[PDB]
C-alpha cells in the first residue's frame, strides 16, 4: 500500500531529488483535507450496518435472486452476500483515508472478477448494489466528503466490470 | 386508440405541433419544421434561406460563384411574393439543380432524390415510382415537378410556409419505408454527390454519374440491410442519448476473426433462447414465494384500527402508527425501488439482455467472415 | 446532444440514482474553472480564419501531389471545398470544448465522415494531417505559446484544457483513420 | 437535451458560425445561477424518500376511490407502481436542476405521457395532486435557500402545467 | 430448472461443481504479453521492436498494463507522405532513445477493457510520461488516434492487449533531425562585421 | 516499416545491451548505402498520392470498357476499391525497396492474390498494366528524370537502385499474371 | 455529358498538356465530316415512330411466347410499357450520334439497366432482338439502303457514320447482358 504521502516520496526518490516546490504543494493538498477524511472515516464506521441494510433491501432483496434457485438463496449465500458488501465499504474507507486507491488493487480487486465468474455471482447485480450503497453513504458525509468517498466506489465497480 | 390522425392529414385546429411528432424522433434532432413568420427581419430571412439550401440541395455546397444564378429567385423570396413552396419549385426548375441531380442520373435516382428533397419521404412502393416516371417521358421535366408539390400531400404536410424536412412520421405504411428514409438521408456529414458517386466517376469533380444503389429493392420488395440503417443514419443525428441496455449501435467490423469463436457464439445463443422459452413459461404463476400466503396474511391483518393517528399503546407506552397508503400495507421506500433494479436481478430479463448482446456480436462477426482468399489469420 | 452537465445525468440514470453528493462535486469544479474554459474557447474563435490556412497549406507542402493534376485539391472548387471542410471540423471541435463533452462530434460531425470520404475520393492520410496540424495550433493558443501571436490572460495554468482539446482533434483523427 | 449550452450551439450550427460573443455571455449566466440550483438538487438527492412518501399518500387521502376494486389502486402491486411514478417525476426534476433547463422532463417524462395515461386509464389529476402538494410544502427558508426554492418550484410548476 | 445455477456440493446445491470444475482457484493459462503477441502472428514488427529497443524488459513485469500494440499493417502504413516525415529518421541505428519514447507511449498502466470504456472518456499517462486519451463512444474504442480493431486479448499478469490500426505518436514529440556536418565561420572579420557597436546601439551611427 | 534496419541498445536493464550475443550483420551492412536508399523511398512516398491516381486513371483511357456500364469499375464501390489496391500494391513495393528483399512483398501482398482476382472476376490483363505504369513512374522518380517534378538530392548516382525497384514491380506483374 | 470535342479536353488535362497540333487532326476531320452527320441524324427521327413498330413487332414474331399468358408482354399494360422503352433506347443514341460520343448515352440509358431487367425479370435475349432489329433498319436509313422508303440526299461515303452508330447499339447489348 502507498498513500498520498508515500506516492510523492516515491516520485522524488526515483530521481534522487529532495522534495521540491511541486512536491510540497501536493503534500499541503493532503494535509489541508486530512482532518476531513478522519471525520468522514468515523461517520461511515458508525453507520456501516445501516448503509448495507438499506442498500440491500432497496437493490436486491425481493428480487428473483433471493428466491429458490438463485444466488444468495440459502442462509450462507445470504450471509456471504452482506459479508461482501461490508468488505467493499471497509476497504473504500481505507482508500479515502490514504487518498490513493492502491490498497483496493492489492486486497480487493486481486483477481475478483474471475472468482465471481467461476462461482456464478451476478456481476451486474453486485455493481448496482455497490452503487446503491453509494447513494446512502453520500447523504451521510455530505458532498465535499462524498467526493473522495464516491471516487473509490466507482473504482471498485470500474475494476469489477 | 393511441394516435388520432397521421401526418398525411392536415393539422386540426386545436394543436400547435402534430400528435405523431410529439413522441417520435422529430423532437430529438435537427429534422424539424422551420416556419417563416408574418413579418421577417432580413437577418431571419437567412435562417429560412439556409434551411432551404440544406434540404433542397441535400447538403450540397453552393459556392458563391454558383449562388449567383439564384439571386433572381432569392430576391423574389426576400421581397415576399414567393412562398417557401414556390421558391422550391423554381429552385428545382433551376440550372444548378439539373446539373447536380438530373443530367447524369439514372431515372430511378432522380425520382428518389425528388422524393427526398421536395417531399420528406423515400419512395413508398413501386407503382408510385412508375407513375412519376410516366409523366417525364410524356410531359418533360417541367410538369413533373408539379407532381410532387401540386398534389394533396405537400399541402397537408408542409403547407406553404414550412421548409421541407425529413419526416419521422410515426406510422409507416410499409414498415420497409422507414429503412429507405434512413438509407437516403444517410448521415449529417453526407451528401448526394458522395452517395451517388458523382465526384469519383467524373473528371475533377465534374461530369459525374449520379448512379443509384438499392434499385432492386424498389422493384422486388426486399428489405434494406440493417447496417445501412444503423451506422450512417438520421438515427445517429437524432440519437436519444439514452441508456439502452440493448445498445443499437453498430460496432466496427473487426479485422482478425476466426471460425472457432463464431461457433462458440452461435451455440451460446441457442443455449440462451432455449432457456428463454422455458423460463418465460415457468414465470407468471409460481415465480413469487410470498404469493400463496397473500390471501391468508391479508385476512389476518384487518383489525385493531386507530383513526386519530397515535394509538396502539401496547401497555401504557405510545406507538406512532401512520395511516399512509403505502405504510398501511407494511411497505417501505425500498418497496417501489425494487422495480428499478430488475435488470441485473430478474432471471427472465437477464436472459433476454444476455441474448441480444450476443446476437449483436454475432451479426458483426458473421459479416466480417464474408471475406476471402488472401486473409492473414491469428492465434486469438 | 449532451454537454458535461447532461453526460453525468445519463450516467446517473443508468443506475437510477439522484445526482447527489460525490456526483455533484465534479460539476462544481466544472464551473469553478468555467472562466478558463471561456477564455480558452475565445483563443480559438479569434484566430480561426488563419487556423485553417496554416493547416491546409501545411498539408500541401508535405504531400505536394494534392495540387498536381488529377489530385484532390487540384481545381479551385476542389480547393475551396477543402478549406470549407477544414473550418467545419474546427467549428465542431469548438462546440465540444465549449460543451465539455464529445457528443456533438459523435452525433453530427463524424456521422458518416469516413463513409463520405471514400465515396468522394478524399485521401484519408492527408486529411488526418490537416486535423493534426490544427491540434498543434490549438494547444499553442490555449497555453499561450504561439510563436507569432500572444494574447493577454490572467495568471495560472490551462494545462488541462489543452489536453482536452487535444482529445477531440484525434477522436476526429481516429474516426476517419 | 435542452440546456443553456445546447441552445447556443444548435442555433450557431444552424447558422454556420463559431461560438460567438453572445454565446459565451449566456454561459456566464450558467455560472451565476449554478449554485442556486445545484443547492436544490442536493437537497432533493438526500431527502427524496421522505418527500415521495409524503407526496404519495396525499394522492390517496385526496382520492380514496382509487383503492376500490376496478380502479388504479386495487392491490399492493399497483400501489407500489404509484409511489414509483412519483419517484420518477421527482428524480427527473433533480435531473433538470443539474442540467440547467427542461431537458430531462421533456424527452423522458412528458413526450408521450398524454398517450400512456389514456390507454392505461391512469387519472392525471391524481398525478398533479402529488406534485402540487410538494410545491405547497416548500417552506422557502427552512427547506433550502430562497433562490433555490425559486429554482425548485419552477420545474414543479412546469410539470403541473404540462400534465394539466 | 433455472438459467444461472450456483456451484457447490452437498445439500442446498444445484448439481454444478464448485467453480464449474471443482477448481475454486484455477491456474493461469494465459501467457506473457511478449509471447501472446508473438503467437498471434500479426504483432511481428511490434514485438521485434520491443526486443531491439529494450522496452521488452518492462512489458513483462507483473504490473497491470493495457497495451495498444499496432498490427503489422499499421507499421506498414507509416509509408504515408506525412507520417514518414516524422518517423523516417527513427530508422537510423543511433536513434534508439527516440524509438523507446515512441514505443513506451503504447503501454498504459491499468487494465482497461473494451467493455469498461463503453461511453466513457478516460485520460491517463503512458509509460513514456505523456497524457493519452481513451474514449469508447458508440462502441468505437479509440486510443488517441488509434481506433482499436481487435478489442481484447487476455494475458498473463492480468494484463490486456488491444490491436490498433495506426501508430500513436506522443503529443510533445519532436522528430530528431537528420545527421549534418559541422559548419564553421569562414572569416573572423565577417563575424565582427555583424556585431552592432555601442554607437549603433545609441543611434549615433548608421 | 521500422524493422527494415538495425539499432544499438546501449543502456542497462534492457538484455539486448549484453545478452543479445548477436548483431544483425546483414542489416548493419545494409546501412552502407542506406542514405541513398532512404532518398529513393522518400522519392516515392512523397509522390505516392499521385502515382496511384495517375496509374488507375492511366488505364481507363487505355481500356475504356472498364467504366462502361457492366464493366468492373462502373459502380462506386469498385472504383474506390481499385484505388485502394494501387495504394496497397505501391506501398508494399516501397517496403521491399527499404528492406532490400522481396520477402514482405511475396508474403503480405502477393501470397494469395492471383486466385482472389479470378474469384472476383477482376480483369487481370488491365491490372498488370497499372503496375507497369507504376513501374515507369518509379524509375523516373528515382533517377530524378521525371518531367514536372524534380527534387533536391545530393549529387551522385541512383542507378542500381532503380533497376532493383524495376525487379519488384514485374515480380508483382508475374505473381498475378 | 460530353461530346467528341470535350473528350480530348479531359484526356489532355489528365496528363496536363495543351491541346495542340497533334491531337487536333482528328477533330478537324470530325468537323469536316460533321455536315454528313447532320443529314445522317435526320434520317432516324423521320422514321422513329414507324421504326419501333417495324422493330418490336419483329421481336414478337421471332419469339411468340411473350404474348402468351405468363409471357413478359402479355398484358395491355406491358405491351405499351415495352413500346415505352422501344424508343428511349433510340432517343439516347440520337443524342450520342449528334454529339459524336456516348457519355450521355451510358449516363441516362444504361446506368443500371442490367440490374433493372434482372430485378424485373425481363427476358434478356429478346431485348437484344429489340436492338439488333433496330440496327438493321437504322443503318439501312443512314446508308440510304432501305427497300421500301427512299429519301433524297447527295452521294458520297456515309459508312463511317453507319458504323459509329453500329458501335452505339453494341453498347446496349454488352451492358444489359
Ligand atoms: C490516358 C490514356 C493517359 C493518362 C492519364 C496519362 C497517364 C500516364 N502517365 C504515364 C507516365 C508517367 N506518369 C508520371 C506521373 C507523374 N508525373 C508527375 O510529375 C506527377 C507527380 C505524376 C502524375 C500526377 C511519370 C513521372 C511518368 C513517366 C514519364 C515522364 O517522364 O513523365 C503513362 C505511361 C507511359 C509509360 O509508362 O512510359 C500513362 C498511361 N497518359 C496517358 O496516355
Ligand atoms: C488558459 C486558457 C489561459 C488563462 C486563462 C485564465 N482565464 C482566467 C480568468 C478569466 N477569463 C475571463 C474571460 C472569460 N469569461 C467570460 O465570461 C468571457 C466572455 C463572455 C470570457 C472571455 C474572466 C472573466 C476571468 C475571471 C477573471 C477576470 O477577468 O475578472 C484565469 C484566472 C483563474 C480563474 O479565474 O479561475 C486563468 C488562469 N490564463 C493562462 O495563463 C492561460 C494562457
Ligand atoms: C399512483 C399514485 C398513480 C398511478 C400509477 C400507476 N402507474 C402505472 C404504470 C405506468 N406508469 C408509467 C409512467 C412512469 N414510468 C416511467 O418510466 C416514468 C418516467 C421516467 C413514469 C412517469 C408507465 C410507463 C407505466 C406502465 C409500465 C409500468 O408498469 O411501469 C400503473 C399500473 C397500471 C396498470 O398496470 O394497469 C399504476 C397503478 N396510478 C394511480 O392511481 C396514480 C395516478
Ligand atoms: C450518308 C450518311 C448519306 C449522305 C450524307 C451526305 N450529306 C451530305 C451533305 C449535306 N447534308 C445537309 C443537311 C443537313 N445540314 C443541316 O444543317 C441540316 C438541318 C438544319 C441538315 C439535314 C447539308 C446542308 C449538306 C451539304 C450540301 C448542301 O446541301 O449544301 C454529303 C455531301 C458531302 C459533304 O457535305 O461533305 C453527303 C455524302 N449522303 C447520302 O447519299 C447518304 C444517304
Ligand atoms: C412495443 C410493443 C415494442 C417496442 C416498440 C418501439 N417502437 C419504437 C419505434 C418504432 N416502432 C415502429 C413500429 C411500427 N411503426 C410503424 O410505422 C409500423 C408500420 C408501418 C410499425 C410496426 C417503427 C417503424 C419505429 C421507428 C419510427 C419512429 O421512431 O418514428 C420505439 C422507440 C424507439 C426509440 O425512440 O428509439 C419503441 C420503444 N419496444 C418494445 O420494447 C416493445 C417490445
Ligand atoms: C480538405 C481538408 C480535404 C478535402 C476535402 C474535400 N471535400 C470535398 C467534398 C465534401 N466534403 C464534405 C465534408 C464536410 N461536410 C460536412 O457536412 C461535414 C461534417 C459536418 C464535413 C467534414 C462533404 C459533405 C462533401 C461533399 C460536398 C458536396 O456534396 O457538394 C471535396 C470535393 C468537392 C467537389 O468535388 O466539388 C474535397 C476536395 N480534400 C483534400 O484533399 C483535403 C484532405
Ligand atoms: C538517390 C535517388 C538520389 C541521391 C541520393 C544520395 N543521397 C546521399 C546522401 C544523403 N541522403 C540523405 C537523406 C536520407 N538520409 C536520411 O537519414 C533520411 C531520413 C531521415 C533521408 C531521406 C542524407 C542525410 C545524406 C547524407 C548527406 C551526405 O552524405 O552528403 C548521397 C551521397 C552519400 C551516399 O551516396 O551514400 C547520394 C548519392 N543522389 C542522386 O543523385 C539521386 C537523385
Ligand atoms: C484495381 C486497379 C483493379 C481492381 C481492384 C478491386 N479489388 C477489389 C477487392 C479486393 N482486392 C483485394 C486485394 C488487395 N487487398 C489487400 O488487402 C491486398 C494486400 C494484402 C490487396 C492486393 C482484396 C482482399 C479485396 C476484397 C476486399 C474488399 O473488397 O474490400 C475490388 C472490389 C471487388 C468487388 O467489389 O467485387 C476491385 C474493384 N479491379 C479492377 O477492375 C482493377 C483492374
Ligand atoms: C510547407 C509549409 C508549411 C507551413 C504553412 C507551416 C504550417 C505549420 N504550422 C505549424 C505550427 C503553428 N502554426 C500556427 C498557425 C498560425 N500562426 C499564427 O499565429 C497564425 C494565426 C497562423 C498562421 C496564419 C501556430 C500558432 C503554430 C504553433 C507555434 C507558433 O506559431 O507560435 C505546424 C506544426 C509544427 C510543424 O510541423 O512544424 C505546421 C506544419 N509549416 C510548414 O512547413
Ligand atoms: C425537497 C425539499 C423538501 C421540503 C420542502 C421538505 C418538505 C417537508 N417538510 C417537512 C416538515 C415541516 N415543514 C414545516 C414548515 C412549515 N410548516 C408550516 O406550517 C409553515 C407554513 C411552513 C414553514 C415554511 C414544519 C413546521 C415541519 C415540521 C412539522 C410538520 O411536519 O408539519 C417534512 C417532514 C420531515 C421533515 O421534518 O423534514 C418534509 C418532507 N423536505 C424536503 O426534503
Ligand atoms: C391481356 C390483354 C390483352 C389484350 C387487350 C390484347 C391486345 C393486343 N392486340 C395486339 C395485336 C393486334 N390486335 C389486332 C386487333 C384488331 N385489328 C383489327 O382490325 C380490329 C379493329 C382489332 C380487333 C377486332 C391486330 C390485327 C393485331 C396484330 C398487330 C401486330 O401484332 O403487330 C397486341 C400486340 C401483341 C400481339 O400481337 O399479340 C396486344 C397486346 N392482347 C392481350 O394479350
Ligand atoms: C431511363 C432509362 C429507362 C429505360 C431504358 C426504360 C426501360 C424500363 N422499362 C421498365 C418496365 C418494362 N420494360 C418492359 C420492356 C420489355 N419487355 C420485353 O419483353 C422486351 C425485352 C422489352 C421491350 C421491348 C416491360 C414489358 C415493362 C413493364 C413491366 C411490368 O409492367 O410488369 C422499367 C422499370 C420502371 C417501370 O416499370 O415503371 C424501366 C426502367 N425506362 C426508363 O426509364
Ligand atoms: C413478324 C413480322 C415481321 C415484320 C413486320 C418484318 C419486320 C422487319 N423489317 C425488317 C427490315 C426493314 N424494316 C424497315 C422499317 C420500315 N420500313 C419502312 O420503309 C418504314 C419506314 C418502316 C416500317 C414503318 C426498313 C427500312 C428495313 C430495311 C429494308 C428496306 O425497307 O429497304 C427486318 C430485318 C431485316 C429483314 O428481315 O429484312 C424485320 C425483322 N419481318 C417480320 O418477320
Ligand atoms: C476482501 C476482498 C474479498 C471479496 C470481495 C471476496 C469474495 C468471495 N465471495 C464469495 C462467495 C459469494 N459471494 C456472493 C455474492 C453476491 N450475491 C449476490 O447476489 C450479489 C450479486 C453478490 C454480493 C451481495 C454469494 C451469494 C456467495 C456464496 C457462494 C457460495 O457459497 O457458493 C467467496 C467464496 C467463499 C465463501 O463461500 O464465503 C469469496 C472468496 N473475498 C475476498 O477476500
Residue F88 CB-density burial (10 A; 0-12 exposed, 13-18 middle, 19+ buried): middle
> Nearest by CB to B106, which of G2, G108, G120?
G108
Residue F75 touches partner C, C-beta closer than 8 Å: no
Residue position matching grid coordinates 523516373: F140
- Residue C41 phi, psi dihedral angles, 5° rounding: -70, -35
Q: Which three cell numbers stand for residue B47?
A: 435562417
Q: Please, which residues bridge with residue E70 across strands?
A: E164
F10 alpha carbon to ligand 11 midpoint, in Å? Answer: 96
CA distance A150 to chain C (A): 5
Residue G67 CB-density burial (10 A; 0-12 exposed, 13-18 middle, 19+ buried): middle
> Which atom of ligand 11 has the smallest separation from the CA of G75?
1
- Residue A46 phi, psi dihedral angles, 5° rounding: -85, -30
Provide the residue range defining the domain that includes F74. Answer: 1-177
Sort out which chain A residues have CB atoms less than 8 A from E5's CB and list them. Answer: 69, 120
- Ligand with an atom nearest the CA of residue F47: 1
D9 alpha carbon to ligand 5 midpoint, in Å? Answer: 30
Three-state SS for D68?
Answer: coil
- The H or E element that residue B93 is part of is none
Q: Please, what is the angle between helix G159-176 and helix G88-99, to 10°?
A: 130
Dist. CA E147–CA F76, nearest whole Å: 25
> Cα dist. C168→A47, C68, C103, C162, D11 in Å?
43, 31, 10, 10, 21
Residue F46 touches partner C, C-beta closer than 8 Å: yes
Closest chain C residue by Cα to residue A145 = C22
Is the minimum distance from the CB of D78 to ligand 3 under 6 angstroms?
yes
Is the minimum distance from the CB of G48 to ligand 13 under 6 angstroms?
no
End-to-end CA distance of chain D: 23
Dist. CA C40–CA D110, nearest whole Å: 37
| Fold classified for D1-164 | Globin-like (1.10.490)
Whether F31 contacts E93, CB under 8 Å: yes
Handedness of CA E10, E15, E21, E25 (dihedral sign): negative
Sort out which chain C residues have CB atoms less than 8 A from G14's CB and list them. Answer: 69-70
Chains near E with 3+ CB pairs less than 8 A apart are: A, B, C, F
Q: Please, which residues bridge with residue E163 across strands?
A: E150
Sort out which chain F residues have CB atoms less than 8 A from G103's CB and list them. Answer: none
Cα within 13 Å of Cα(E113), Cβ side: 13
Q: Which three cell numbers stand for residue B286?
A: 409460481
Dist. CA D114–CA D34, nearest whole Å: 32
Q: Which three cell numbers stand for residue A23?
A: 512536491
G123 alpha carbon to ligand 11 midpoint, in Å? Answer: 21
> Cα dist. C130→B360, C134, C139, C140 in Å?
35, 7, 15, 16
Dist. CA A135–CA A154, nearest whole Å: 12
Q: Based on the structure, what is the number of domains in chain F?
A: 1
Chains near C with 3+ CB pairs less than 8 A apart are: A, B, D, E, F, G
F79 alpha carbon to ligand 8 midpoint, in Å? Answer: 10
Closest residue CA from atom 4 of ligand 8: F82
DSSP C109: I
> Nearest by CB to B372, which of F75, F76, F116?
F116
Three-state helix/strand/coil letters over chain F: CCCCCCCCCCCCCCCCCCCCCCCCHHHHCCHHHHHHHHHHHHHHHCCHHHHHHHHHHHHHCCCCCCCCCCCCCCCHHHHHHHHHHHHHHHHHHHHHHHHCCCHHHHHHCCCCCHHHHHHHCCCCCCHHHHHHHHHHHHHHHHHCCCCCCCCCCCCCCCCCCCCHHHHHHHHHHHHCC
Dist. CA E134–CA E162, nearest whole Å: 12
Three-state SS for E130?
Answer: coil
Give Cβ neighbours of residue E189 (< 8 Å, ≥ 6 apart). none
Question: Is there an interface between A and E (3+ Cβ pairs < 8 A)?
Answer: yes
Three-state SS for E168?
Answer: coil
Dist. CA C72–CA E18, nearest whole Å: 64
What was the elucidation method?
Answer: cryo-EM
Angle at F16 between CA F12 and CA F22, to 5 degrees: 140
Note whether D98 contacts C48, CB cutoff 8 Å. no
Sheet holding E107-109, edge to edge: E107-109, E65-67, E160-163, E150-154
Residue A54 touches partner C, C-beta closer than 8 Å: no
Dist. CA D27–CA C26, nearest whole Å: 18
Three-state SS for G63?
Answer: coil
CA-nearest of F57, D58, B211 to G106 is B211
Structural domain boundaries of chain D?
Answer: 1-164
Q: Please, which residues bridge with residue E135 across strands?
A: E142
CA-nearest of D48, D93, E118 to C11 is E118
CA-nearest of A113, A74, A114, A65 to E2 is A65
> Nearest by CB to A125, which of B289, B334, B344?
B344
Residues in the ligand 9 pocket, defined by CB under 6 Å: C 47, 50, 53-54, 57-58, 61, 133, 136-137, 140, 146-149
CATH number assigned to the domain comprising residue G127: 1.10.490.20
Dist. CA B286–CA B233, nearest whole Å: 44
Note whether F115 contacts B373, CB cutoff 8 Å. yes
Chains near D with 3+ CB pairs less than 8 A apart are: A, B, C
Resolution to one decimal, Å: 2.8
CA distance A55 to chain B (A): 9
Dist. CA D130–CA D126, nearest whole Å: 7
Angle at C68 between CA C64 and CA C73, to 5 degrees: 80
> Nearest by CB to D48, which of C18, C24, C48?
C18
Test site for ligand 13: of G60, G137, G138, G142, most ligand atoms within 8 A of the Cβ = G137
CA-nearest of E186, E6, B157 to A119 is E6
Consult the annotation and say whether F61 binds a ligand. Answer: yes
- CB contacts under 8 A, B 274-293 vs E, are 275, 278-279, 282
Angle at D115 between CA D109 and CA D119, to 5 degrees: 125
- CB contacts under 8 A, E 41-60 vs F, are 45, 48-49, 51-54, 56-57
- Residue E95 phi, psi dihedral angles, 5° rounding: -95, 65
CA distance B211 to chain F (A): 8
Amino acid at each position: 500500500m502507498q498513500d498520498a504521502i508515500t506516492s510523492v516520496i516515491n516520485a522524488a526518490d526515483v530521481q534522487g531529488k529532495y522534495l521540491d516546490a511541486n512536491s510540497v504543494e501536493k503534500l499541503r493538498g493532503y494535509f489541508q483535507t486530512g482532518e476531513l477524511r478522519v471525520r468522514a472515516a468515523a461517520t461511515i464506521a458508525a453507520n456501516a450496518a445501516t448503509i448495507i441494510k438499506e442498500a440491500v433491501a432497496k437493490s436486491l432483496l425481493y428480487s428473483d435472486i433471493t428466491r429458490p434457485g438463485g444466488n444468495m438463496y440459502t442462509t450462507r449465500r445470504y450471509a456471504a452476500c452482506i459479508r461482501d458488501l461490508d468488505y467493499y465499504l471497509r476497504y473504500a474507507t481505507y482508500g479515502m483515508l490514504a487518498g490513493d486507491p492502491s490498497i483496493l488493487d492489492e486486497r480487493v480487486l486481486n483477481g475478483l472478477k474471475e472468482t465471481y465468474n467461476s462461482l456464478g455471482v451476478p456481476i451486474g447485480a453486485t455493481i448496482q448494489a455497490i452503487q446503491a450503497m453509494k447513494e446512502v453513504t453520500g447523504s451521510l458525509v455530505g458532498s465535499d466528503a462524498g467526493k473522495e468517498m464516491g471516487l473509490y466506489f466507482d473504482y471498485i465497480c470500474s475494476g469489477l466490470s | 386508440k393511441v394516435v388520432d390522425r397521421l401526418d398525411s392529414q392536415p393539422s386540426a385546429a386545436f394543436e400547435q405541433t402534430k400528435q405523431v411528432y410529439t413522441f417520435s424522433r422529430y423532437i430529438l434532432g435537427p429534422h424539424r419544421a422551420v416556419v417563416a413568420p408574418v413579418a421577417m427581419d432580413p437577418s431571419e430571412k437567412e435562417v429560412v434561406l439556409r434551411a432551404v439550401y440544406r434540404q433542397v440541395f441535400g447538403n450540397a455546397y453552393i459556392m458563391e460563384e454558383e449562388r449567383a444564378e439564384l439571386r433572381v429567385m432569392e430576391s423574389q423570396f426576400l421581397l415576399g411574393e414567393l412562398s417557401v413552396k414556390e421558391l422550391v419549385r423554381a429552385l428545382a426548375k433551376s440550372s444548378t439543380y439539373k446539373v447536380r441531380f438530373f443530367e447524369g442520373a439514372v431515372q430511378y435516382r432522380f425520382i428518389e432524390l425528388c422524393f427526398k428533397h421536395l417531399l420528406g419521404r423515400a419512395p413508398d412502393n413501386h407503382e408510385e415510382i412508375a407513375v412519376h416516371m410516366r409523366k417525364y417521358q410524356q410531359e418533360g421535366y417541367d410538369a413533373e415537378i408539379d407532381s410532387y408539390l401540386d398534389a394533396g400531400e405537400y399541402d397537408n404536410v408542409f403547407g406553404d410556409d414550412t421548409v421541407p424536412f425529413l419526416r419521422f412520421r410515426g406510422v409507416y405504411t410499409p414498415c420497409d419505408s422507414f429503412n429507405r428514409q434512413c438509407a437516403l438521408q444517410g448521415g449529417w456529414a453526407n451528401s448526394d454527390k458522395a452517395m451517388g458517386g458523382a465526384a469519383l466517376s467524373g473528371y475533377n469533380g465534374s461530369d459525374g454519374r449520379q448512379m443509384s444503389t438499392m434499385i432492386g429493392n424498389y422493384i422486388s420488395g426486399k428489405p434494406i440491410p440493417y447496417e445501412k440503417v444503423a451506422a450512417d443514419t438520421p438515427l445517429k443525428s437524432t440519437a436519444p442519448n439514452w441508456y439502452a441496455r440493448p445498445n443499437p449501435a453498430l460496432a466496427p467490423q473487426p479485422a482478425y476473426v476466426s471460425a472457432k469463436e463464431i461457433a462458440e457464439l452461435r451455440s451460446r445463443v441457442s443455449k440462451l433462447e432455449a432457456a428463454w422459452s422455458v423460463a418465460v413459461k415457468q414465470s407468471a404463476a409460481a415465480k413469487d414465494t410470498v404469493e400463496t400466503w397473500r390471501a391468508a396474511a391479508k385476512e389476518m391483518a384487518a383489525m385493531r384500527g386507530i383513526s386519530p393517528m397515535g394509538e396502539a399503546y401496547f401497555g401504557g407506552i405510545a406507538q406512532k402508527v401512520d395511516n399512509g397508503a403505502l405504510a398501511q400495507l407494511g411497505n417501505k421506500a425500498s418497496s417501489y425501488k425494487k422495480y428499478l433494479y430488475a435488470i441485473e436481478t430478474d432471471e427472465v430479463s437477464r436472459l433476454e439482455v444476455d441474448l441480444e448482446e450476443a446476437k449483436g456480436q454475432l451479426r458483426v462477426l458473421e459479416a466480417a467472415m464474408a471475406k476471402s482468399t488472401p486473409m492473414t489469420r491469428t492465434a486469438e | 446532444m449532451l454537454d458535461a452537465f447532461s453526460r453525468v445525468v445519463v450516467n446517473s440514470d443508468a443506475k437510477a440514482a439522484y445526482v447527489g453528493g460525490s456526483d455533484l462535486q465534479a460539476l462544481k469544479s466544472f464551473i469553478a474553472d468555467g472562466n478558463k474554459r471561456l477564455d480558452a474557447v475565445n483563443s480559438i474563435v479569434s484566430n480561426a480564419s488563419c487556423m485553417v490556412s496554416d493547416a491546409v497549406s501545411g498539408m500541401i507542402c508535405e504531400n505536394p501531389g494534392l495540387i498536381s493534376p488529377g489530385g484532390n485539391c487540384y481545381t479551385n472548387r476542389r480547393m475551396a471545398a477543402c478549406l470549407r471542410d477544414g473550418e467545419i471540423i474546427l467549428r465542431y471541435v469548438s462546440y465540444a470544448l465549449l460543451a465539455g463533452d464529445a457528443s456533438v462530434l459523435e452525433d453530427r460531425c463524424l456521422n458518416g465522415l469516413k463513409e463520405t470520404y471514400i465515396a468522394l475520393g478524399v485521401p484519408t492520410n492527408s486529411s488526418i494531417r490537416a486535423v493534426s496540424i490544427m491540434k498543434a495550433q490549438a494547444v499553442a493558443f490555449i497555453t499561450n505559446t504561439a510563436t507569432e501571436r500572444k494574447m493577454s490572460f490572467a495568471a495560472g495554468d490551462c494545462t488541462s484544457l489543452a489536453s482536452e482539446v487535444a482529445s477531440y482533434f484525434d477522436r476526429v483523427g481516429a474516426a476517419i483513420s | 437535451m435542452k440546456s443553456v449550452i445546447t441552445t447556443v450551439v444548435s442555433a450557431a450550427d444552424a447558422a454556420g458560425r463559431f461560438p460567438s460573443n453572445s454565446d459565451l455571455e449566456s454561459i456566464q449566466g450558467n455560472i451565476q445561477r449554478s449554485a442556486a440550483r445545484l443547492e436544490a438538487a442536493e437537497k432533493l438527492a438526500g431527502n427524496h424518500e421522505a418527500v415521495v412518501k409524503e407526496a404519495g399518500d396525499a394522492c390517496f387521502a385526496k382520492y380514496a376511490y382509487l383503492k376500490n376494486p376496478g380502479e388504479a389502486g386495487e392491490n399492493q402491486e399497483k400501489i407500489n407502481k404509484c409511489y414509483r411514478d412519483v419517484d420518477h417525476y421527482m428524480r427527473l426534476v433533480n435531473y433538470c436542476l443539474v442540467v440547467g433547463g427542461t431537458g430531462p422532463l421533456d424527452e423522458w417524462g412528458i413526450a408521450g405521457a398524454r398517450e400512456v395515461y389514456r390507454t392505461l386509464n391512469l387519472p392525471t389529476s391524481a398525478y398533479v395532486a402529488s406534485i402540487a402538494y410538494t410545491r405547497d410544502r416548500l417552506c422557502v427558508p427552512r427547506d433550502m435557500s430562497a433562490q433555490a426554492g425559486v429554482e425548485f418550484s419552477a420545474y414543479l410548476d412546469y410539470l403541473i402545467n404540462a400534465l394539466s | 430448472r433455472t438459467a444461472y445455477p450456483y456451484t457447490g456440493s452437498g445439500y442446498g446445491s444445484a448439481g454444478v461443481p464448485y467453480g464449474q470444475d471443482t477448481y475454486g482457484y484455477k491456474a493461469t493459462t494465459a501467457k506473457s504479453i511478449t509471447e501472446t503477441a508473438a503467437q498471434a502472428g500479426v504483432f511481428n514488427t511490434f514485438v521485434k521492436l520491443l526486443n531491439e529497443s529494450g522496452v521488452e524488459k518492462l512489458v513483462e513485469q507483473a504490473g497491470p498494463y493495457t497495451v495498444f500494440a499496432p498490427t503489422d499493417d499499421a507499421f506498414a502504413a507509416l509509408l504515408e507522405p506525412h507520417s514518414f516525415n516524422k518517423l523516417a529518421t527513427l530508422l537510423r541505428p543511433e536513434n534508439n532513445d527516440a524509438l523507446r519514447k515512441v514505443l513506451m507511449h503504447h503501454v498504459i498502466p491499468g487494465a482497461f477493457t473494451s467493455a469498461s470504456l463503453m461511453d466513457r472518456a478516460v485520460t491517463v499517462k503512458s509509460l513514456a510520461g505523456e497524457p493519452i486519451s481513451i474514449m469508447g463512444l458508440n462502441k468505437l474504442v479509440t486510443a488517441g488516434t488509434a481506433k482499436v480493431v481487435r478489442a481484447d486479448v487476455p494475458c498473463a499478469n492480468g494484463c490486456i492487449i488491444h490491436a490498433v490500426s495506426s501508430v500513436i505518436i506522443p503529443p510533445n514529440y519532436v522528430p530528431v533531425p537528420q545527421p549534418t556536418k559541422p559548419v564553421f565561420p569562414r572569416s573572423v572579420i565577417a563575424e565582427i562585421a555583424k556585431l552592432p557597436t555601442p554607437r549603433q546601439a545609441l543611434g549615433l551611427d548608421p
